Ligand binder design. Structure first.
Ligand code: SF4
Ligand code: SF4
Ligand code: SF4
Ligand code: SF4
Ligand code: SF4
Ligand code: FES
Lengths: 166, 127, 240, 384, 196, 180, 127
């Protein structure tokens, strides 16, 4: 039941989800290869709980948009996201995903937050694999309720919990 | 191209668009929400361009929480677009100085500009 | 009309034409600092130098195309190796005493000195030779800097390249001689004993000055030339 | 079964859409659908300075990026008449062959994982990580490095680069020999790849399959020999080839290419003598940063160059090069302005894709993935 | 060796020969002779068809015959049966109101995707093509991007308190038709070339 | 080639018994090369005066147009830069920034120089537009790192170590190779 | 030779004298320009004691009556110069070891500079 309505139970389930964060990569460009580097035998996102990698979208809570999101790919990524189980989070990797990046033109979406509810942003071109790990710990402690913005506000555990999907 | 409503009149623009739309089927129409400042929607304003393919309909920047009742006006507007079967929703980002003159450009130029700059968007973010 | 030939091209041109205007009418280019539209050309920067033949009878020395009249069937050369070499040398002489303010200069991207420098200077001498930018290794002219001449105009006497544009204008167009040089030699500098800048047309010297000597006090340190958005419009303060 | 293998699913690397018209376990015909990565470089570049564009060149083929960098640099140098120092040329060939090794590593890892086993991906990626450490040492960036310049290279090498490069050049022969020992004597890979991937050279030519999968079918055409550009004319060079183009021969040809590239790197490092690093023409190269506090000409040129840039002559130009994916080149129309009039890129990954329905024609359904991985596609290059 | 015979054949029939001192060669055939001439070129042994590149000369400082110009690249592989290595371009101008040009897909199967791309980016329609379908631009995209009459479509860059940047008004670099920020551009900034 | 299955298994066993290779970030500080493109820093002169003279050359050289520079006139009583001009507002949108280094390359005063911090992932678009006072050499950490160290009371530890900092970074303090 | 260090020291000394005369007489002093070799030095070292190259004494109207300048760190034939604007008056001071700051052969004392500045003020100053 969303992991709510008991002081101990919700912290326990958030602990569980935070460490069991299941990445589903949505590789678009070179951000995707720099994310593939976050899994090799120098710096692996295979310790915190992200060892397994199920290509199916029915099986992962974290959606990592890694690369430039072309406007022709926007509905596809939209429906891949909608076709995810509900306790789901969105990471936006790299400049092309976060903003329009250096490609400010008709072809690329200027903020992936337009199509999918983004949870974490991670700048860089490409963002270093260790910056991506910083982002996943950021999201970890976010779903732990340990995340605050520059304005002082605590951030909700799950974005895409706040939208009128339709 | 038709221009209905007036700037900073959310409910007047909403009612004028309610009347002017009629029973028009929006299955192949494209709804362009023109706004500035991608990130901050709490003080954002919105204009609308409805590209049916056979004719276009313009509403000036009169929606959004920037105006009293403009947030609920934008929610009702997008809800009505979705109810009429609109699926292709886009968000266009123009400069504040542009937003005024952009609605005074000729129809072909304004529409070509909007279609070039529009980003596919989840209509839910306006609900 | 008068028949002119610029380096490969033939031009009809009215008789009272300047050689410089015949050059540009042919589509060529030549440095330009002292002369200005609607102002009397007088060879001061000596930048508009070209070659002229009137026969093959080349003139002995280079003609200042800004103050040289045109004759029927006249040849004008702007591409000669010697012509471009002299252009680069004059650019160096002009850059001799300049204060090194380009990054912090309010004149920014649109500085005639900058642009004619990058256009015509550093002629190709003849390999991967290591070339020198500046030969002058002595102390540059240092004079009064950033002096408000009026609530609207600021004066950098170091950036002045001692063209005649501002005093020429002040004498000719408004008819208010409220600006002139004081000393001579290299000690020449712009000054006035009429300090308020009485003329109601003083602000145009800011547009005329090819350097950042005369700048707009009301817009000082706001943005760089390229950064600003230009809206061309008409002024509705009076019916002209 | 007109089956829709969607974009990114299931695990079709290089996001692509496929309409596999297919009954059974064969492959009747694959209808490819691309455009999901189209960014618009050919238009965006018209509104960027020539110096600015050096940030745009690596980002299309992001595996072998320095080939893009080199092709663009060379075309501009031809157009405006620039002189490249010999040491800068040697550094450029070293970086190009190093990014070639990195791209070859990633290609073979992706193929083996795509069909086959997961394990051999990690060794190739460890060697790639050593290469990326070299790239960080020199340029401060892993890839998309903004190091090449129109005159030459941005700056010189640190002291620590040559020792680490010798370390890698000593470990690499054994490593590449290990990959060959695992693969060439293929236990199952043989019965998986030897037959599949029909590549008749005539159809490869008619459809224009130039990109390194052509020599696996027995065509001896390499640009580094046919049209030497960066001084490869002066290198002892073996060009690997294949008998009949299949996945097996493709992969083994690329492995021999990696060893030959290592030998080229050793040779170039041996012929390396100190010197200058870029064309001192100030219209092309920004003034040295040390005298920016002394010369008015330096300051003016620095300011003008870093704001407006420079203006090449009016004309069109093109230069061909050989990347780890085939023939690459830039057709540049310059109008005498500070930004190029138009830049069109010949995409080898794009022209190679016309032979996919033919290549995987009649092949197996599991092998439709292996035959795609073996063709070495990059959708950043294809869609562009 | 086959290139010498191409130049000799083009010069005799009044085909212009454009050459830069850098080593690049064009042979511009008229619209009529385009198809049959390049068929003859393939017959001469031009194995490989490298590129089909479309050009919009609308914003070019000097005028051109027609707005659009398509350039093909023909090659003969050196390491094949009898490889000379002769490679060259064929340029063909195309009217604004007649975006037609015969395909060479029947000749080279390489031209298939390239001509589809040129149709996608410019309104240039290729006659006799097996399938002229939009390749790269989104299915719902209206128009042809790379012809200069089509906007690049930039989005402003965003900062803290009302501070934004419009790149088209922020750019300091100039195009060929851009006058510059001074009264004019001459010298290097009207075109510059060093003498090697 | 039946032998190959056995040889493959054997080499995989050898590498199994080869234990070491990995680095455990954040538990082990990542080794970065000295030229790495990290968080922008504005540098100061020995006088303490800022180097930045607000010349917008870093913004003009920006291919992503991520640098906003509002200039102002130095105050003789309490100066900021070395000339008559300094950086009144210096903002860089890290989400627009593509990390060239062209801004530093156009920097005539050596004010703007790329740093070494990479732990700058954050939650909000509007928080990733870094300001001047988030980039000065005096600051130690990234925005989320500092915010965590303040809402935590636990000092900032950077996840990187380098052999040394470049001279252009003069003043930039970092953990160096074990010098500390 | 090594005279440079004491030259810049005496340059700082003369600047101190100018500041003192300004404060005493209630007349404007201005730092006109700093060293380009200190502005544009990015990482490069700066050993000079001060970064100031040009200064001036301006009257109430802001027009200077006295100008003083020093040669940059890297220029040939290093000197210190003085100028009376509008008076065609120029002075060239060097530094002789043991003696001190001298205009040619004549010692340049603080009293000498004060008398020169007072005369310049009374004559040239407009207000
Ligand atoms: S942000 Fe840089 S690395 Fe990531 S997809 Fe864009 S170009 Fe590639
Ligand atoms: S006047 Fe021109 S050349 Fe002199 S500092 Fe200003 S921009 Fe530079
Ligand atoms: S102040 Fe300017 S316009 Fe007047 S003479 Fe000097 S350079 Fe020419
Ligand atoms: S590093 Fe960032 S701020 Fe600097 S020029 Fe590049 S994109 Fe612009
Ligand atoms: S280029 Fe350097 S000195 Fe100029 S504004 Fe940028 S950081 Fe400051
Ligand atoms: S332009 Fe003729 S001399 Fe100044």
């Amino acid at each position: 039941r969303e992991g709510i309505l008991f002081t101990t139970l919700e912290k326990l389930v958030a602990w569980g989800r935070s460490n069991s964060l299941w990445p589903a990569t949505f590789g678009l460009a070179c951000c995707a290869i720099e994310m593939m580097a976050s899994t090799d035998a120098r710096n692996d996102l295979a310790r915190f709980g992200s060892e397994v990698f199920r290509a199916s979208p029915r099986q992962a809570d974290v959606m990592i948009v890694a690369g430039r999101l072309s406007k022709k790919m926007a509905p596809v990524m939209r429906r891949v996201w909608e076709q995810m189980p509900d306790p789901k989070w969105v990471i936006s990797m790299g400049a092309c995903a976060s903003s329009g990046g250096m490609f400010n033109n008709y072809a690329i979406v200027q903020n992936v937050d337009s199509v999918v509810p983004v949870d974490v942003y991670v700048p860089g071109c490409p963002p270093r694999p260790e910056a991506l790990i910083y982002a996943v710990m950021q999201l970890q402690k976010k779903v732990r309720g340990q995340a605050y913005n520059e304005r002082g506000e605590r951030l909700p555990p799950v974005a895409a919990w706040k939208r009128t999907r339709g | 191209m038709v221009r209905v409503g007036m700037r900073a009149a959310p409910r007047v623009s909403l009612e004028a668009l309610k009347a002017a739309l009629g029973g028009l089927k929006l299955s192949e129409a494209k709804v362009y929400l023109i706004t500035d400042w991608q990130d901050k929607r709490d003080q954002a304003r919105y204009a609308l361009l409805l590209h049916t393919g056979k004719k276009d309909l313009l509403v000036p920047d009169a929606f959004g929480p920037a105006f009293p009742g403009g947030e609920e006006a934008l929610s009702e507007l997008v809800g009505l677009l979705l109810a009429q079967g609109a699926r292709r929703f886009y968000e266009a980002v123009v400069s504040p100085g542009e937003m005024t003159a952009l609605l005074d450009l000729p129809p072909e130029e304004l529409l070509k500009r909007v279609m070039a700059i529009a980003n596919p968007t989840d209509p839910g973010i306006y609900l | 009309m008068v028949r002119v030939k610029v380096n490969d091209r033939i031009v009809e041109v009215p008789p009272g034409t300047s050689v410089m205007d015949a050059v540009f009418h042919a589509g060529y280019d030549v440095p330009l600092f002292c002369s200005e539209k609607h102002l009397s050309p007088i060879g001061a920067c000596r930048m508009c130098l070209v070659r002229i033949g009137l026969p093959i009878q080349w003139q002995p020395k280079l003609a200042a195309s800004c103050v040289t009249a045109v004759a029927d069937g006249m040849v004008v050369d702007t591409l000669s190796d010697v012509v471009r070499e002299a252009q680069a040398g004059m650019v160096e002489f002009t850059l001799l005493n300049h204060p090194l303010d380009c990054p912090t200069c309010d004149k920014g991207g649109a500085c005639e000195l900058q642009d004619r420098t990058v256009e015509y200077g550093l002629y190709e001498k003849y390999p991967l030779e290591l070339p020198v930018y500046t030969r002058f290794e002595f102390t540059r002219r240092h004079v009064d800097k950033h002096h408000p001449l009026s609530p609207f105009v600021i004066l950098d006497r170091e950036r002045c390249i001692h063209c005649k544009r501002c005093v020429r204008y002040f004498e000719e167009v408004p008819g208010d001689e409220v600006l002139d040089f004081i000393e001579r030699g290299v000690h020449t500098f712009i000054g006035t004993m009429d300090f308020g800048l009485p003329s109601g047309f003083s602000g145009n010297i800011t547009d005329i000055c090819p350097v950042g000597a005369l700048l707009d006090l009301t817009a000082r340190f706001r943005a760089r030339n390229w950064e600003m958005e230009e809206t061309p419009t008409t002024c509705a303060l009076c019916p002209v | 079964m007109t089956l829709n293998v969607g974009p990114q699913h299931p695990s079709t690397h290089g996001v692509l859409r496929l309409m596999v018209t297919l009954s059974g376990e064969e492959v009747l015909e694959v209808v490819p659908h691309i455009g999901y990565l189209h960014t618009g470089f050919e238009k965006t570049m018209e509104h960027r300075t020539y110096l600015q564009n050096i940030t745009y060149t690596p980002r299309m083929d992001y595996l072998h990026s320095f080939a893009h960098d080199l092709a663009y640099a060379l075309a501009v140098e031809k157009l405006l008449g620039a002189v490249v120092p010999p040491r800068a040329e040697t550094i450029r060939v070293i970086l190009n062959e190093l990014s070639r090794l990195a791209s070859h590593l990633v290609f073979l890892g992706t193929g083996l994982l795509d069909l086959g086993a997961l394990t051999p991906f990690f060794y190739a990626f460890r060697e790639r990580e050593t290469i990326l450490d070299l790239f960080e040492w020199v340029t401060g960036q892993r890839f998309h490095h903004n190091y090449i310049r129109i005159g030459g290279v941005k700056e010189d090498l640190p002291e620590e680069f040559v020792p680490e490069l010798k370390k890698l050049l000593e470990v690499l022969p054994h490593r590449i020999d290990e990959y060959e020992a695992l693969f060439a004597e293929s236990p199952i890979f043989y019965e998986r790849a030897r037959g599949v991937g029909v590549i008749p050279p005539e159809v490869a030519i008619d459809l224009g399959l130039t990109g390194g999968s052509l020599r696996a079918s027995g065509v001896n055409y390499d640009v580094r020999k046919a049209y030497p550009y960066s001084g490869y004319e002066t290198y002892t060079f073996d060009v690997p080839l294949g008998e009949r183009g299949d996945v097996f021969d493709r992969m083994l040809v690329r492995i021999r290419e990696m060893r030959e590239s290592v030998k080229i790197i050793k040779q170039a490092l041996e012929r390396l003598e100190p010197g200058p690093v870029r064309d001192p023409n100030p219209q092309i190269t920004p003034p040295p940063r040390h005298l920016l506090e002394t010369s008015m000409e330096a300051v003016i040129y620095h300011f003008k160059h870093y704001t407006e840039g420079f203006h090449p002559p009016k004309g069109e130009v093109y230069v061909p090069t050989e990347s780890a994916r085939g023939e690459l080149g830039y057709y540049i129309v310059s109008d005498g302005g500070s930004m190029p009039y138009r830049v069109k890129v010949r995409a080898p990954s794009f022209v190679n894709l016309q032979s996919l329905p033919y290549a995987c024609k009649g092949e197996q359904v599991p092998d439709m993935v292996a035959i795609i991985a073996s063709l070495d596609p990059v959708m950043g290059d294809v869609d562009r | 060796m086959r290139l010498e015979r191409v130049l000799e054949e083009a010069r005799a029939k009044g085909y212009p020969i454009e050459d830069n001192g850098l080593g690049n060669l064009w042979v511009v055939l008229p619209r009529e002779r385009f198809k049959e001439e390049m068929a003859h070129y393939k017959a001469m042994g031009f194995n490989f068809l490298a590129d089909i590149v479309g050009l919009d000369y609308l914003t070019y400082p000097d005028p051109r015959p027609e707005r659009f110009a398509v350039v093909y690249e023909l090659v003969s592989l050196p390491g094949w049966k009898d490889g000379d290595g002769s490679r060259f371009f064929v340029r063909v101008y195309v009217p604004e109101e007649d975006p037609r040009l015969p395909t060479v897909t029947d000749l080279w199967g390489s031209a298939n995707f390239l001509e589809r791309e040129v149709y996608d980016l410019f309104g240039i329609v290729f006659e006799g093509h097996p399938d002229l379908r939009k390749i790269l631009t989104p299915e719902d995209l209206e128009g042809h991007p790379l012809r200069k009459d089509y906007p690049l479509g930039e989005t402003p860059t965003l900062f803290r308190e009302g501070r934004y940047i419009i790149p088209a008004e922020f750019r300091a670099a100039l195009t060929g038709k851009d006058p510059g920020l001074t009264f004019y551009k001459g010298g290097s900034r009207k075109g510059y070339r060093s003498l090697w | 080639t039946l032998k190959a299955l056995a040889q493959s298994l054997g080499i995989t066993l050898k590498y199994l018994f080869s234990k070491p290779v990995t680095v455990p970030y954040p538990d082990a500080p990542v080794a970065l090369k000295p030229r790495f493109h990290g968080r922008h820093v504005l540098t100061r002169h020995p006088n303490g005066l800022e180097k930045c003279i607000g010349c917008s050359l870093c913004a003009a050289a920006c291919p992503a147009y991520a640098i906003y520079v509002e200039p102002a006139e130095n105050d003789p009583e309490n100066p900021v830069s070395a000339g008559e001009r300094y950086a009144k507002v210096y903002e860089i949108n890290m989400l627009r920034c593509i990390f060239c280094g062209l801004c530093e390359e156009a920097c005539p005063t050596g004010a703007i120089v790329l740093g070494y911090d990479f732990e700058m992932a954050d939650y909000e678009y509007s928080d990733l537009v870094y300001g001047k006072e988030d980039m000065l050499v005096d600051v130690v950490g990234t925005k989320p790192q500092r915010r965590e160290a303040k809402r935590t009371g636990k000092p900032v530890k950077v996840g990187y170590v380098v052999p040394y900092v470049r001279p252009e970074l003069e003043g930039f303090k970092a953990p160096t190779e074990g010098g500390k | 030779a090594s005279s440079e260090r004491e030259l810049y020291e005496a340059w700082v000394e003369l600047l101190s004298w100018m500041r003192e005369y300004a404060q005493a007489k209630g007349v404007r002093f201005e730092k006109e320009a700093d060293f380009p070799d200190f502005i544009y030095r990015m990482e490069r070292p700066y050993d000079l004691p001060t970064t100031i190259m040009t200064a001036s004494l301006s009257d109430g109207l802001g027009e200077p009556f006295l100008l003083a300048d020093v040669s940059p760190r890297h220029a040939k034939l290093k000197r210190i110069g003085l100028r009376l604007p509008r008076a065609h008056i120029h002075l060239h001071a060097h530094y002789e070891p043991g003696k001190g700051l001298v205009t040619g052969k004549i010692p340049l004392t603080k009293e000498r500079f004060f008398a020169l500045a007072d005369r310049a003020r009374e004559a040239l100053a407009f207000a």
